């Protein structure tokens, strides 16, 4: 399939669910792994649609057209969102398929980029993509430390320090 159209059945209805909320110190998906720069969702955990991620991709291509770059996607739309009619009454079963979506935890990377381009030219492409995506986004470089929840592990900070009851 694709990162926007999975090889799943639209008839099997999926429960709403919730995005992951790491409460045990997990940094899963909070670092740049493939590209040199990344786009991080820094505010809150959300469920992004496939039409919003497609527009974000078009915005990065429209701004970087005519140049050499490699765009990576770290999210996959594998969550079916079934919307019942707004004009319908409550009950009478679950709604029909509307669109695909993906659940993203806080401080996770959405897009990564690698190419022979200038940093400022990539900051603008991610700035525009962030403007059109739901929530607040941030520019990240490869090598930056991971994030535990909403706290960055900077200046020798470790996960065991965040778990230690004594922190004063």
């Amino acid at each position: 399939g694709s990162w926007l159209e999975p090889n799943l059945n639209r008839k099997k209805k999926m429960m709403k669910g919730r995005p992951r909320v790491p409460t045990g110190g997990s940094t899963k998906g909070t670092t740049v792994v493939w590209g040199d720069y990344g786009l991080r969702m820094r505010d809150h955990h959300r469920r992004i649609s496939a039409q919003q991620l497609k527009l974000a991709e078009d915005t990065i291509k429209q701004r970087l057209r005519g140049q050499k770059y490699r765009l990576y996607k770290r999210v996959a739309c594998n969550v079916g969102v079934y919307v019942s009619g707004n004009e319908m009454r409550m009950g009478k079963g679950k709604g029909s398929f509307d669109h695909w979506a993906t659940r993203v935890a806080v401080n996770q990377i959405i897009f990564e980029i690698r190419g022979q381009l200038h940093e400022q030219v990539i900051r603008d492409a991610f700035r525009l993509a962030g403007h059109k995506l739901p929530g607040l986004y941030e520019f990240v470089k490869k090598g930056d430390p991971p994030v535990v929840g909403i706290t960055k592990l900077e200046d020798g900070l470790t996960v065991e320090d965040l778990k230690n009851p004594r922190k004063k």
């Binding site: 909320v21 790491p22 409460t23 045990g24 110190g25 505010d43 809150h44 806080v106 994030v147 535990v148 929840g149 909403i150 706290t151 996960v159 965040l162 778990k163 009851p165 004594r166 922190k167 004063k168």
Partner: protein
């Protein structure tokens, strides 16, 4: 909703002072129990577990004394006075990172 539960998002300096003293009072109950048993050379699993994964008021940060974790909030924090029976239940530790 139309039913008003007027609960301010933050606490007053008077509610905070009492919170510090309630956390301080609980520490004295545990220390009094731990010291009384140590004189006899005894131990209780509940006490050994409290002194291992719970700090003292003097070791807590203000954010941990007046707020709690709430996954539904913007910044994953919430007024501790919004917890049920918050003046008679223990609450000192939140998930790491928040």
């Amino acid at each position: 909703g139309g039913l008003l539960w007027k609960i301010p998002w933050r606490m007053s300096k008077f509610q905070k002072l009492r919170q510090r003293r309630r956390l301080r009072a609980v520490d004295n109950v545990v220390a009094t129990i731990e010291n009384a048993l140590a004189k006899k050379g005894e131990t209780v699993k509940a006490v050994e577990r409290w002194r291992a994964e719970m700090p003292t008021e003097a070791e807590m940060l203000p954010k941990d004394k007046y707020t709690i974790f709430d996954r539904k909030e913007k910044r994953y924090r919430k007024g501790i006075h919004k917890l049920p029976k918050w003046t008679r239940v223990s609450q000192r530790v939140n998930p790491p990172g928040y």
